[PDB]
Amino acid sequence: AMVQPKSQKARLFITHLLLLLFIAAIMFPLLMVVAISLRQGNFATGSLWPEQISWDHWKLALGFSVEQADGRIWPPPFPVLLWLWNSVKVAGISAIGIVALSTTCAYAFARMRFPGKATLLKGMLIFQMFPAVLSLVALYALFDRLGEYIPFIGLNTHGGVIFAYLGGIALHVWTIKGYFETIDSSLEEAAALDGATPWQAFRLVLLPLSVPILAVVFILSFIAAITEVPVASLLLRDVNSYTLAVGMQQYLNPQNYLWGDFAAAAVMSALPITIVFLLAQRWLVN
């Protein structure tokens, strides 16, 4: 509550005006995709924000009904719920694998010590901030050669998807190691004093203390898996096997552009938005 001059009110008014204008500019695309979802037509034009509430696209995207408009019935365009189910399966398996593979590495890198720690951490950073840069060609060739041997991880299967998705361990090991550093460093020493073998010291003392960060990592990697596009698009070909973010492309196609159905699906994908808004943000002091 510092005593401040009369210029403070002017600064506050200017800041409020600028922030309101900026938020309007930012929310224009989202409000426009919301309004388009309620538009009757799928080719847009007409009125920018129609007052009518058709809801036909939502029911098409839900698949609840065919939404008879004229004599001819309109079958659902694409199985969005099937997209969601495949995406959920892939994301769940990928998140479980990421957590299981990353927790022990985070422990080793953060709490205990070993001679090769500096080189291992440097290599961890080095191979962590790689993206999926040209690895797609190698993955495609490898899955082509492997599908004849073991089909369940070969091509046009979820096995290749999950195998490509398990790389996120390099990214998540840093978050879990940061949490491990946050936890007090005398806990393992005290546990060893009471007679705990270091494996028990991890399992009984520090592992139950990792539940919040493990849940946060699970949610973050689940979202990153649900919203992935490159690998799934490249090696997913069968129409029934498509995950999310890959049929969305088929929604917008030059032979048939579909605003209403695409927007209905996009606002049906509102749940990841809220999840990342609240659980991923974890209401940490920003």
Binding site: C105, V133, L136, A245
Partner: protein
């Protein structure tokens, strides 16, 4: 080869029950094996593919035996090791070198511009949000973060629809306000401009979060002393906050530069085929990053599916490893 690699990964041999450094690595191996199999292995394979002639005519390894001399030469041998032939052909060809240099320059310009714009917008938003004299700061944080919460592909495809030309939403809004047709997809310059706008819109909230954290790390006594001396808001921002933010922000700027360099998902989802260079042996567009150039050579049907050229490992991953070394040097700083 895969069996030998897996056997190496399994019997690394450092699991000897001796309570030595073996124990420590017994914790690291789970996940270290995961990386060695799921991250390093594709990279090494991409390295191996470059030295070969893997293509739509040589995709098969050896299975075609019958399907005399029986074309037992080199090219009918399908998968063969050429050796630096694909590396030389990216330069000496001059049919793919010029497009390569053009998209390289465009990628560098795009990444630098988007990094600077993103850093500036995020830093300004963070400084304004942490005023402690505002109202509804939580609401403002939520609203300014919403682009981060919305899944990326959804926003990219929404922008693809909005910036459409055949029917269009933003275009006819602009026509109603003052009649002009920007022609985003047709004109390469407008395509790059829309591309920069979309990348900034996607990327600003992350740097806003990072700057908000760094302002939290910044103490308040310096601000109080400046206020005692008589400094105003802008003087405070330019002589207190900014000098103490660029020093811990340079590695973040470099990492964002790398990410915007390899933004395959964005450049592939939005205007994947921005107006083609019109005279390229391999397909290539003006709004093409290096990653999607290689993707076009790899899997797009018109590119001939030349996997050997599609590697381009020693260019992309080598500038990327230079970036790794630079950020690693900056991380050990102070």
């Amino acid at each position: 080869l895969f069996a030998i690699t897996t056997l190496i990964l399994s019997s690394a041999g450092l699991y000897i029950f001796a309570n030595r450094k073996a124990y420590a690595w017994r914790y690291v191996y789970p996940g270290m094996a995961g990386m060695g199999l799921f991250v390093l292995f594709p990279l090494v394979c991409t390295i191996a593919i470059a030295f070969t002639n893997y293509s739509s005519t040589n995709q098969l390894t050896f299975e075609r035996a019958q399907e005399n001399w029986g074309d037992e030469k080199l090219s009918p041998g399908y998968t063969v090791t050429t050796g630096w032939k694909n590396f030389t052909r990216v330069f000496t060809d001059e049919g793919i070198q010029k497009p390569f240099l053009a998209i390289f320059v465009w990628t560098v310009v795009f990444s630098l511009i988007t990094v600077f714009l993103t850093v500036a917008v995020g830093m300004v938003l963070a400084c304004l949000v942490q005023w402690e004299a505002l109202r509804g700061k939580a609401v403002y944080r939520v609203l300014l973060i919403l682009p981060y919460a919305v899944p990326s592909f959804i926003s990219i495809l929404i922008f693809k629809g909005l910036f459409n030309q055949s029917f269009g939403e933003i275009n006819m809004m602009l026509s109603a306000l003052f009649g002009v047709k920007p022609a985003w997809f047709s004109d390469p310059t407008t395509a790059r401009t829309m591309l920069i706008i979309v990348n900034t819109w996607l990327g600003y909230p992350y740097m806003m979060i990072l700057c908000m954290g760094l302002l939290k790390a910044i103490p308040d006594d310096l601000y109080e002393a400046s206020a005692m001396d008589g400094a105003g808001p802008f003087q405070n921002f330019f002589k207190i906050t900014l000098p103490l933010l660029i020093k811990p922000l340079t590695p973040l700027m470099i990492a964002s530069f790398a990410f915007n360099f390899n933004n395959f998902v964005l450049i592939q989802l939005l205007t994947n085929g921005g107006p083609d260079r019109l005279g390229t042996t391999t397909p290539a567009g003006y709004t093409d990053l290096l990653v999607n150039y290689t993707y076009r050579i790899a899997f797009e049907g018109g590119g001939g599916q030349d996997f050997g050229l599609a590697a381009a490992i020693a260019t992309l991953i080598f500038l990327l490893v230079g970036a790794l070394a630079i950020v690693n040097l900056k991380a050990t700083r102070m």
